[PDB]
Amino acid sequence: TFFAPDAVFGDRVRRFQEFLDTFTSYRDSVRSIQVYNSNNAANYILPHRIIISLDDLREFDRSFWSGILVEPAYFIPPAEKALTDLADSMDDVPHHPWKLSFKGSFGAHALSPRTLTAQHLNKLVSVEGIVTKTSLVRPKLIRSVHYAAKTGRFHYRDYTDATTTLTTRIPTPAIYPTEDTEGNKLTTEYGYSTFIDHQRITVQEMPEMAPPRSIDVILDDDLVDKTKPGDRVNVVGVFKSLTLILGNTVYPLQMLTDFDIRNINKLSKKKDIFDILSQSLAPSIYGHDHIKKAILLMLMGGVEKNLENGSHLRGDINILMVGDPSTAKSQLLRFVLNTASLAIATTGRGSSGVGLTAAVTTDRETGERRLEAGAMVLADRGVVCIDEFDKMTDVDRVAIHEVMEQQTVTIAKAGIHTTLNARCSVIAAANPVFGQYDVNRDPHQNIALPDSLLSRFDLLFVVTDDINEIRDRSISEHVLRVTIPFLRKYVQYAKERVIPQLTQEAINVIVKNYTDLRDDNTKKSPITARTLETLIRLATAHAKVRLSKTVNKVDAKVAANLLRFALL
Amino acid sequence: VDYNNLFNEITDFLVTFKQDKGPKYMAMLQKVANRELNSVIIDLDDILQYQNEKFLQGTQADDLVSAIQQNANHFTELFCRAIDNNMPLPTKLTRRYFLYFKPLSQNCARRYISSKPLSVRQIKGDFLGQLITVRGIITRVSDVKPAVEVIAYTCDQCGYEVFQEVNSRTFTPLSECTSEECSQNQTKGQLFMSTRASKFSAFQECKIQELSQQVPVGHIPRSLNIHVNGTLVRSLSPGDIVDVTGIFLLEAQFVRQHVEERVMELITSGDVYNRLAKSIAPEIYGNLDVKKALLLLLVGGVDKRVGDGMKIRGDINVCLMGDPSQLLKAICKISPRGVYTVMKDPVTDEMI
Amino acid sequence: TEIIKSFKNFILEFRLDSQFIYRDQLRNNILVKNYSLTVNMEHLIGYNEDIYKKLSDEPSDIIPLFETAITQVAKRISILSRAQSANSLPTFQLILNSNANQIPLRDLDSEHVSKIVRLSGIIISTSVLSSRATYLSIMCRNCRHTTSITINNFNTGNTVSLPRSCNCGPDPYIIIHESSKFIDQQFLKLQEIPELVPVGEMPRNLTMTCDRYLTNKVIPGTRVTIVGIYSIYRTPYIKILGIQSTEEEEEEFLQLSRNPKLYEILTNSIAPSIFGNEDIKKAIVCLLMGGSKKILPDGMRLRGDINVLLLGDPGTAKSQLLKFVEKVSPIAVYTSGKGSSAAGLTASVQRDPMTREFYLEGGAMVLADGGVVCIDEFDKMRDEDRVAIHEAMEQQTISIAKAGITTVLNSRTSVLAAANDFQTTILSRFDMISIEKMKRYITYCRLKCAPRLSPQAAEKLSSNFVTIRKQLLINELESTERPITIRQLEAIIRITESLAKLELSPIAQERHVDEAIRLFQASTMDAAS
């Protein structure tokens, strides 16, 4: 500013001007920013930042790219000076700074916060994770305007932070002025005094990208409305140590090639795909084909239909599994936790809060009470697994009573009232209170759960283990003796691309099946209104396992076969 | 932005009003000269009508409504002197009145923006100094307390009473004499304070909270602080919804508390009751009677007061007993403030 | 300057297997921007006697000269490599490892201070990754003058200090936080091996300072060999400059592996004064490695480790055999029920006394990554540690979640407990109710092989399971209510894999399953009565 600029600033500002003259994608974007501001001023705003694609910076200039990657304190400045000069040159109407933003691959600079150490301080760091806290928005002091009343005129003295600079200049304080030159009092004016607001958020590692690391981000005025706890985020900042990161770019959030799409398109029309895909998930567990068929239909999902001008419809499916404790029910949760897209498993007993969803805490920093999010609020589209369902208390039962029908949750507590809506298909595993169970005992009191929870859960799978000499001969040689990265790509491509719709060929057979069962009410199991919804959810599932654009009659037939196995 | 012509526009506005006795602002100055009121309310509708009268006569407008909206703290100390330059004679530091503002409505906004209903999540940071109209519930209120504005000091040696102006939360006692007689003197005699000549103000803090259906998905309704002064001090009773219009340092200026084509096209279709019954929650099957009573439940009814110390309920309470959440969620999503289901405070020492 | 040329000739002129080993390593580390290089002390003592003795006597004044010579040749490497395809270079921190000597912690004396020192131990703590500076711009607040100060290797009465004067008076300086470089550093704690520590006193510890290139390279709880400078801050401390963690031994191990009565002499060697209990001794010696760890392609892998539990009257070496398994196995630490005196099996939490900070104390549960754990007094367990050991005995993972720290710790930890709602955790979560050459063979077998099972020996296991399920059902339908599961069959499979793994073979036969059913029958007889 006051100092004379050397050739080290002029060469970098002419190189950024040559890069902006070569690529007009930012020039027309800032012209669009200015014409949008002019249209809003003519009617009477956008927070003045342009995202720069880094892929055009590597092939254009190698040294400029290396200087941005190793010295942003000496490289960012002249680029924003070039951007402000381009904003002044692109506008010709009469009459503020402008900032920058980046995107793209970083290489070794993109890392986990637990691996973020004292190395590469000055260099810019791209780090992803989950946010834990978002502080209160606080305005700062810059340029207060004072009015001296006896002579009648204005004075103004401005301040400077010691972080928002990404570089170097002389630093010193200044008393908030209370008396102008000589002996006379002067008044403050805040009408024109700027109050740039700042925020202080905390972000730690996502549990998948870590062998725990949490850091602090100081936030400017511009991006203060795009942060909230519970969402996966990726921040881009500078690791300054007066240790914190000066976050300039925030992005709230397996790779697919063209060879894998040929394989999943080749496996889309064969009518033997479903049975071998259900048999290929767990080879260490003998038997239970229809249970893992429902588990395959469970982890792929539904459709999540949102009705017009009304409440949303549940797309998630829920499964409860009971039986003797001898089999692999506790060994299947580790497989579904390690092979899904994102999954959260809890023990069902031992939650420090009031349950999974949340908890209250006191903080002496603010001297107030904050909210802690224990579980179900983190996974919003994935799956959650609860083993030992009978040991879970009534508070979490009242919460999942809301969870099931809601595919959401609600909380009203001392000083807050709200509702949360994150998708979270549940996988519950329970044990009886008698320890063992056989066919001759009644199937209702052995469950040790209320009838409302039987109506909440869609598929109740009973696994029997009475000793039989015929079937028990090959378990020892089977455990004494398609792949994992393929079904993940299969499930996510089905989840992102194809949405199935209904046909007349699959409405009548499911109407016939629901009216025929509404038999079970006199013989073995109650029938509810919800079950109608769960009888087509599964059909849609099968129809999207084959990734067809609409449903078929065989999807309702395999849903009825799953019903006959899980009900009788 | 110039002040020399805008102050002339301000002093020309209060004497040339005929749109809404006679010159109403001079009549209000006669009423404050009669010593019957202490509050001055300035609206932007009169400003808009005076601007229309000045613009239709070919004169220069020199816009006030685009200048009142930014930095109203300078305008409340600048237009006050223009009101102070002219007063009628009475027939029955020297501020007898209190100046306050109020914004224009949306009906005067469509009929030729500045007053939008703002959230506390919609503050962005950069609105510190704009007049804002916030809508929300009030949970925390405080007692009315006298806060000083200027400290009056008296002396027996010189007689010249001095007055200092405080701006912050705290201050220091000026024990040293800064008069015009003690500067040219060896003696620097003791000064005393006056609690009678010092100007006070009825200060009160309040915590506005974010509205329930205006908060986003998953977020919690965070609060904000409003600092009121003067005659507005008893217009805020807790347990209500309010629209507060004030500057953002929150220094409130005006408070209030709780389309024809849209209601007439809903009426003219015929069978209004059955249409409004079958319109809400159409993703379920039948049950027009249960949800018809739910329609009569959310419309509420009439609260009856006998005026002799007895109040009966004007409300309905409906039970839904059934065998093996959507209707309940649709009722809470359509109706406002729908929620799905005392202590002492030591720091400030009160009943929260 | 002559030492500069000598170190540059040592870098660009050392040859091993007809190739340079430092030039290509410097080019590969500059190309990934690691700013470090691995030098060996044996190569420089084989190259020059004028370097090693002076490095051993005075390392503090010769080491940064070597460091600036490394940066001087690194600048040339960087400018000739940057000009080929596609400014500011920091001081390249060197790491240097060797294995010429391993002195114990009790041999540390008043002599050879500030010299080179290499020793082994167990890292107990590396909690803080604090910040220091390496280059800082300083300015004044009165006469508007600024300058800068640089430091390279000195990271309580040291060189780092602000100048009292440039009148401006005392301390008018402000650190320009906009232009500096941050050098992360760590404070670590190290203790001697608890298998060889005298019984009259607890094991002592030592504090060490860790720099920038080796940060977060050591997990606390392993066999770590540290080489640095024994400096004094009176109190001693270690400046780390290097980190790491006989064919006749393998010849005698191969000669001992060819003995057919080897299992038998091993059992005649693990019990010098223990009368009887051969089935307890074989189950103790077979529960070290665990079983066959198999990584299936579906992701649902199987657990290999097992569980063993001692029970009985006081005496009979219930806590004397545990000292031999603490000093014999690769990674194991001796603890007790509900922690111990100033040490705890569970993840302890307490106050940093500086200004009362909350922080964590790793017990024997995080420090035993990839081995077994061994505790005494199983009846004395707290409720906050029982749920953690209840999940870790069957899932190996320990989950923790509190204020700012949420983590799932991997705990390949087998349990060898001793004891005297508890009935189900005793009867269901437990499957059973030279020395350096042996430890080397155990480590080589745990890392090298991954065995399997033949169906010819698996049919005997199937017939044994069918007969035990057909025979104990008479006792079970008679309302005795005591069991028989597939988890015990999987434990039998893991026991056979461990017994077939001890002879370093990937295949299993009937020779190991006939001893495995004999090992399992004593546990069933103890469980039945």
PDB file of C-alpha atoms in Angstrom, chain B residues 11-197:
ATOM      1  CA  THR B  11     -36.995  21.020   7.691  1.00  0.00           C
ATOM      2  CA  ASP B  12     -39.151  21.694   4.601  1.00  0.00           C
ATOM      3  CA  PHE B  13     -41.069  18.425   5.008  1.00  0.00           C
ATOM      4  CA  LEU B  14     -42.514  19.077   8.489  1.00  0.00           C
ATOM      5  CA  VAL B  15     -44.077  22.437   7.575  1.00  0.00           C
ATOM      6  CA  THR B  16     -45.520  21.545   4.145  1.00  0.00           C
ATOM      7  CA  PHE B  17     -47.709  18.522   4.954  1.00  0.00           C
ATOM      8  CA  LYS B  18     -51.370  18.496   3.891  1.00  0.00           C
ATOM      9  CA  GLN B  19     -51.869  14.821   2.871  1.00  0.00           C
ATOM     10  CA  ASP B  20     -52.703  13.496   6.347  1.00  0.00           C
ATOM     11  CA  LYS B  21     -54.898  21.111  13.041  1.00  0.00           C
ATOM     12  CA  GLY B  22     -53.692  21.237   9.435  1.00  0.00           C
ATOM     13  CA  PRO B  23     -49.904  20.722   9.375  1.00  0.00           C
ATOM     14  CA  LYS B  24     -49.941  17.580  11.590  1.00  0.00           C
ATOM     15  CA  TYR B  25     -46.234  17.666  12.524  1.00  0.00           C
ATOM     16  CA  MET B  26     -46.594  21.286  13.696  1.00  0.00           C
ATOM     17  CA  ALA B  27     -49.754  20.178  15.540  1.00  0.00           C
ATOM     18  CA  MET B  28     -47.711  17.400  17.191  1.00  0.00           C
ATOM     19  CA  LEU B  29     -45.126  20.059  18.110  1.00  0.00           C
ATOM     20  CA  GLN B  30     -47.979  22.127  19.578  1.00  0.00           C
ATOM     21  CA  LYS B  31     -49.084  18.995  21.475  1.00  0.00           C
ATOM     22  CA  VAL B  32     -45.554  18.496  22.821  1.00  0.00           C
ATOM     23  CA  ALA B  33     -45.565  22.256  23.581  1.00  0.00           C
ATOM     24  CA  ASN B  34     -48.801  21.641  25.524  1.00  0.00           C
ATOM     25  CA  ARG B  35     -46.797  18.926  27.398  1.00  0.00           C
ATOM     26  CA  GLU B  36     -49.175  16.008  26.864  1.00  0.00           C
ATOM     27  CA  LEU B  37     -46.931  13.529  25.032  1.00  0.00           C
ATOM     28  CA  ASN B  38     -43.269  12.509  25.024  1.00  0.00           C
ATOM     29  CA  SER B  39     -43.040  10.262  21.947  1.00  0.00           C
ATOM     30  CA  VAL B  40     -42.445  11.303  18.333  1.00  0.00           C
ATOM     31  CA  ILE B  41     -43.295   8.804  15.585  1.00  0.00           C
ATOM     32  CA  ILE B  42     -42.064   9.397  12.020  1.00  0.00           C
ATOM     33  CA  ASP B  43     -43.400   7.294   9.138  1.00  0.00           C
ATOM     34  CA  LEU B  44     -41.985   6.776   5.663  1.00  0.00           C
ATOM     35  CA  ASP B  45     -45.426   6.976   4.009  1.00  0.00           C
ATOM     36  CA  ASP B  46     -45.556  10.758   4.516  1.00  0.00           C
ATOM     37  CA  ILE B  47     -41.977  10.911   3.172  1.00  0.00           C
ATOM     38  CA  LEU B  48     -43.084   8.929   0.081  1.00  0.00           C
ATOM     39  CA  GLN B  49     -46.121  11.193  -0.449  1.00  0.00           C
ATOM     40  CA  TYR B  50     -43.993  14.353  -0.029  1.00  0.00           C
ATOM     41  CA  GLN B  51     -41.479  12.859  -2.491  1.00  0.00           C
ATOM     42  CA  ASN B  52     -44.313  12.175  -4.958  1.00  0.00           C
ATOM     43  CA  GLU B  53     -45.607  15.755  -4.545  1.00  0.00           C
ATOM     44  CA  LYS B  54     -42.101  17.134  -5.095  1.00  0.00           C
ATOM     45  CA  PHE B  55     -41.393  14.850  -8.063  1.00  0.00           C
ATOM     46  CA  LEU B  56     -44.662  15.567  -9.867  1.00  0.00           C
ATOM     47  CA  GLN B  57     -44.031  19.331  -9.739  1.00  0.00           C
ATOM     48  CA  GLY B  58     -40.721  18.982 -11.568  1.00  0.00           C
ATOM     49  CA  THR B  59     -38.619  19.718  -8.483  1.00  0.00           C
ATOM     50  CA  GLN B  60     -35.628  17.690  -7.347  1.00  0.00           C
ATOM     51  CA  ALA B  61     -36.561  14.816  -5.054  1.00  0.00           C
ATOM     52  CA  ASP B  62     -33.158  14.222  -3.299  1.00  0.00           C
ATOM     53  CA  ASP B  63     -34.245  10.874  -1.793  1.00  0.00           C
ATOM     54  CA  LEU B  64     -34.767  10.415   1.936  1.00  0.00           C
ATOM     55  CA  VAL B  65     -36.086   6.826   1.968  1.00  0.00           C
ATOM     56  CA  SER B  66     -32.823   5.486   0.502  1.00  0.00           C
ATOM     57  CA  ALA B  67     -30.893   7.525   3.079  1.00  0.00           C
ATOM     58  CA  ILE B  68     -32.987   6.898   6.209  1.00  0.00           C
ATOM     59  CA  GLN B  69     -32.538   3.107   5.724  1.00  0.00           C
ATOM     60  CA  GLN B  70     -28.752   3.300   6.176  1.00  0.00           C
ATOM     61  CA  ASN B  71     -27.226   4.914   9.326  1.00  0.00           C
ATOM     62  CA  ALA B  72     -30.375   5.904  11.242  1.00  0.00           C
ATOM     63  CA  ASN B  73     -28.294   6.692  14.357  1.00  0.00           C
ATOM     64  CA  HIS B  74     -26.850   9.756  12.617  1.00  0.00           C
ATOM     65  CA  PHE B  75     -30.301  10.652  11.281  1.00  0.00           C
ATOM     66  CA  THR B  76     -31.945  10.501  14.714  1.00  0.00           C
ATOM     67  CA  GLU B  77     -29.387  13.044  15.992  1.00  0.00           C
ATOM     68  CA  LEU B  78     -29.445  15.140  12.807  1.00  0.00           C
ATOM     69  CA  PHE B  79     -33.184  15.474  12.138  1.00  0.00           C
ATOM     70  CA  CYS B  80     -33.784  16.101  15.866  1.00  0.00           C
ATOM     71  CA  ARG B  81     -31.938  19.429  15.581  1.00  0.00           C
ATOM     72  CA  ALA B  82     -34.078  20.305  12.551  1.00  0.00           C
ATOM     73  CA  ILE B  83     -37.184  19.649  14.658  1.00  0.00           C
ATOM     74  CA  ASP B  84     -35.440  21.669  17.405  1.00  0.00           C
ATOM     75  CA  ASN B  85     -34.916  24.684  15.118  1.00  0.00           C
ATOM     76  CA  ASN B  86     -38.676  25.425  15.088  1.00  0.00           C
ATOM     77  CA  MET B  87     -41.252  25.049  17.877  1.00  0.00           C
ATOM     78  CA  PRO B  88     -44.503  26.864  18.626  1.00  0.00           C
ATOM     79  CA  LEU B  89     -44.855  28.857  21.823  1.00  0.00           C
ATOM     80  CA  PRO B  90     -46.442  27.048  24.799  1.00  0.00           C
ATOM     81  CA  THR B  91     -49.855  28.162  26.012  1.00  0.00           C
ATOM     82  CA  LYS B  92     -50.161  26.023  29.144  1.00  0.00           C
ATOM     83  CA  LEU B  93     -29.958  18.159  27.192  1.00  0.00           C
ATOM     84  CA  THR B  94     -33.170  20.122  26.711  1.00  0.00           C
ATOM     85  CA  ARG B  95     -34.882  17.265  24.853  1.00  0.00           C
ATOM     86  CA  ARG B  96     -38.469  17.214  26.082  1.00  0.00           C
ATOM     87  CA  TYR B  97     -39.429  14.527  23.563  1.00  0.00           C
ATOM     88  CA  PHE B  98     -38.099  11.202  22.293  1.00  0.00           C
ATOM     89  CA  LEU B  99     -37.624  10.568  18.577  1.00  0.00           C
ATOM     90  CA  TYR B 100     -38.595   7.244  17.014  1.00  0.00           C
ATOM     91  CA  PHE B 101     -39.141   5.791  13.553  1.00  0.00           C
ATOM     92  CA  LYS B 102     -41.360   3.279  11.765  1.00  0.00           C
ATOM     93  CA  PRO B 103     -40.955   1.828   8.258  1.00  0.00           C
ATOM     94  CA  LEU B 104     -43.323   1.626   5.298  1.00  0.00           C
ATOM     95  CA  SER B 105     -45.505  -1.410   4.707  1.00  0.00           C
ATOM     96  CA  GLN B 106     -45.605  -3.690   1.669  1.00  0.00           C
ATOM     97  CA  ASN B 107     -48.835  -2.023   0.484  1.00  0.00           C
ATOM     98  CA  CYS B 108     -46.983   1.289   0.190  1.00  0.00           C
ATOM     99  CA  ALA B 109     -44.047  -0.601  -1.332  1.00  0.00           C
ATOM    100  CA  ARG B 110     -46.017  -2.081  -4.234  1.00  0.00           C
ATOM    101  CA  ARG B 111     -47.669   1.307  -4.705  1.00  0.00           C
ATOM    102  CA  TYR B 112     -44.455   3.115  -5.652  1.00  0.00           C
ATOM    103  CA  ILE B 113     -37.864  -3.609  -0.036  1.00  0.00           C
ATOM    104  CA  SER B 114     -36.714  -1.410   2.815  1.00  0.00           C
ATOM    105  CA  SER B 115     -38.920  -3.287   5.300  1.00  0.00           C
ATOM    106  CA  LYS B 116     -38.724  -7.024   4.743  1.00  0.00           C
ATOM    107  CA  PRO B 117     -39.475  -9.661   7.439  1.00  0.00           C
ATOM    108  CA  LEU B 118     -36.003 -10.816   8.363  1.00  0.00           C
ATOM    109  CA  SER B 119     -34.822 -13.963  10.107  1.00  0.00           C
ATOM    110  CA  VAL B 120     -31.851 -14.055  12.451  1.00  0.00           C
ATOM    111  CA  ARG B 121     -30.224 -16.613  10.137  1.00  0.00           C
ATOM    112  CA  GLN B 122     -30.872 -14.102   7.326  1.00  0.00           C
ATOM    113  CA  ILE B 123     -28.663 -11.480   9.012  1.00  0.00           C
ATOM    114  CA  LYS B 124     -25.477 -12.286   7.032  1.00  0.00           C
ATOM    115  CA  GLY B 125     -23.329  -9.915   9.118  1.00  0.00           C
ATOM    116  CA  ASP B 126     -23.268  -6.968   6.607  1.00  0.00           C
ATOM    117  CA  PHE B 127     -26.711  -5.680   7.699  1.00  0.00           C
ATOM    118  CA  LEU B 128     -25.218  -3.987  10.767  1.00  0.00           C
ATOM    119  CA  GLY B 129     -26.675  -0.534  10.337  1.00  0.00           C
ATOM    120  CA  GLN B 130     -29.774  -1.125   8.247  1.00  0.00           C
ATOM    121  CA  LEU B 131     -33.277  -0.830   9.630  1.00  0.00           C
ATOM    122  CA  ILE B 132     -34.612  -4.353   9.963  1.00  0.00           C
ATOM    123  CA  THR B 133     -38.004  -5.802  10.809  1.00  0.00           C
ATOM    124  CA  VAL B 134     -37.544  -9.086  12.651  1.00  0.00           C
ATOM    125  CA  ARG B 135     -40.340 -11.550  13.373  1.00  0.00           C
ATOM    126  CA  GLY B 136     -40.140 -13.889  16.313  1.00  0.00           C
ATOM    127  CA  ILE B 137     -41.210 -15.097  19.722  1.00  0.00           C
ATOM    128  CA  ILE B 138     -39.941 -13.486  22.889  1.00  0.00           C
ATOM    129  CA  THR B 139     -38.649 -15.734  25.649  1.00  0.00           C
ATOM    130  CA  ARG B 140     -36.336 -13.567  27.748  1.00  0.00           C
ATOM    131  CA  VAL B 141     -37.235 -10.076  28.927  1.00  0.00           C
ATOM    132  CA  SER B 142     -35.707  -7.979  31.690  1.00  0.00           C
ATOM    133  CA  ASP B 143     -36.919  -5.378  34.151  1.00  0.00           C
ATOM    134  CA  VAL B 144     -37.077  -1.681  33.345  1.00  0.00           C
ATOM    135  CA  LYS B 145     -33.944   0.054  34.593  1.00  0.00           C
ATOM    136  CA  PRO B 146     -32.731   3.664  34.448  1.00  0.00           C
ATOM    137  CA  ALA B 147     -29.592   4.021  32.350  1.00  0.00           C
ATOM    138  CA  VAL B 148     -27.896   7.405  32.339  1.00  0.00           C
ATOM    139  CA  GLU B 149     -27.070   9.209  29.077  1.00  0.00           C
ATOM    140  CA  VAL B 150     -25.322  12.316  30.430  1.00  0.00           C
ATOM    141  CA  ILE B 151     -23.696  12.796  33.845  1.00  0.00           C
ATOM    142  CA  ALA B 152     -24.232  16.189  35.511  1.00  0.00           C
ATOM    143  CA  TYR B 153     -21.554  17.571  37.841  1.00  0.00           C
ATOM    144  CA  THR B 154     -22.010  20.589  40.102  1.00  0.00           C
ATOM    145  CA  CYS B 155     -19.465  22.840  41.816  1.00  0.00           C
ATOM    146  CA  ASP B 156     -19.768  25.367  44.623  1.00  0.00           C
ATOM    147  CA  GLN B 157     -16.576  27.218  43.724  1.00  0.00           C
ATOM    148  CA  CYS B 158     -17.489  28.324  40.211  1.00  0.00           C
ATOM    149  CA  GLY B 159     -21.160  27.492  39.770  1.00  0.00           C
ATOM    150  CA  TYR B 160     -20.775  26.303  36.182  1.00  0.00           C
ATOM    151  CA  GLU B 161     -22.360  22.879  36.107  1.00  0.00           C
ATOM    152  CA  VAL B 162     -20.724  20.567  33.589  1.00  0.00           C
ATOM    153  CA  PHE B 163     -22.246  17.684  31.635  1.00  0.00           C
ATOM    154  CA  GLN B 164     -20.378  14.702  30.213  1.00  0.00           C
ATOM    155  CA  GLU B 165     -21.779  12.186  27.744  1.00  0.00           C
ATOM    156  CA  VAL B 166     -21.422   8.431  28.207  1.00  0.00           C
ATOM    157  CA  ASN B 167     -21.758   5.937  25.369  1.00  0.00           C
ATOM    158  CA  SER B 168     -20.493   2.591  26.631  1.00  0.00           C
ATOM    159  CA  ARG B 169     -21.773   0.253  29.328  1.00  0.00           C
ATOM    160  CA  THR B 170     -19.314   1.659  31.867  1.00  0.00           C
ATOM    161  CA  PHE B 171     -17.674   5.002  32.623  1.00  0.00           C
ATOM    162  CA  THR B 172     -15.248   6.734  34.946  1.00  0.00           C
ATOM    163  CA  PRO B 173     -15.945   9.623  37.362  1.00  0.00           C
ATOM    164  CA  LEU B 174     -14.458  12.897  36.162  1.00  0.00           C
ATOM    165  CA  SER B 175     -13.069  14.135  39.481  1.00  0.00           C
ATOM    166  CA  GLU B 176     -10.857  16.709  37.759  1.00  0.00           C
ATOM    167  CA  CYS B 177     -12.600  19.984  36.970  1.00  0.00           C
ATOM    168  CA  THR B 178     -12.836  20.842  33.280  1.00  0.00           C
ATOM    169  CA  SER B 179     -14.756  24.104  33.640  1.00  0.00           C
ATOM    170  CA  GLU B 180     -14.029  27.422  31.968  1.00  0.00           C
ATOM    171  CA  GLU B 181     -13.066  29.096  35.251  1.00  0.00           C
ATOM    172  CA  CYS B 182     -10.792  26.445  36.785  1.00  0.00           C
ATOM    173  CA  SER B 183      -8.463  26.384  33.769  1.00  0.00           C
ATOM    174  CA  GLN B 184      -7.126  29.871  34.586  1.00  0.00           C
ATOM    175  CA  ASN B 185      -6.676  29.070  38.283  1.00  0.00           C
ATOM    176  CA  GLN B 186      -4.379  27.528  40.858  1.00  0.00           C
ATOM    177  CA  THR B 187      -7.284  25.996  42.778  1.00  0.00           C
ATOM    178  CA  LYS B 188      -8.971  22.889  41.361  1.00  0.00           C
ATOM    179  CA  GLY B 189     -11.881  22.367  43.834  1.00  0.00           C
ATOM    180  CA  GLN B 190     -14.027  19.222  44.281  1.00  0.00           C
ATOM    181  CA  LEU B 191     -17.018  18.389  42.082  1.00  0.00           C
ATOM    182  CA  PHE B 192     -20.219  16.551  42.976  1.00  0.00           C
ATOM    183  CA  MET B 193     -22.793  14.564  41.040  1.00  0.00           C
ATOM    184  CA  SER B 194     -26.477  15.280  40.501  1.00  0.00           C
ATOM    185  CA  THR B 195     -29.001  12.479  40.043  1.00  0.00           C
ATOM    186  CA  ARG B 196     -31.752  14.993  39.251  1.00  0.00           C
ATOM    187  CA  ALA B 197     -30.282  17.093  36.437  1.00  0.00           C
TER     188      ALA B 197
END
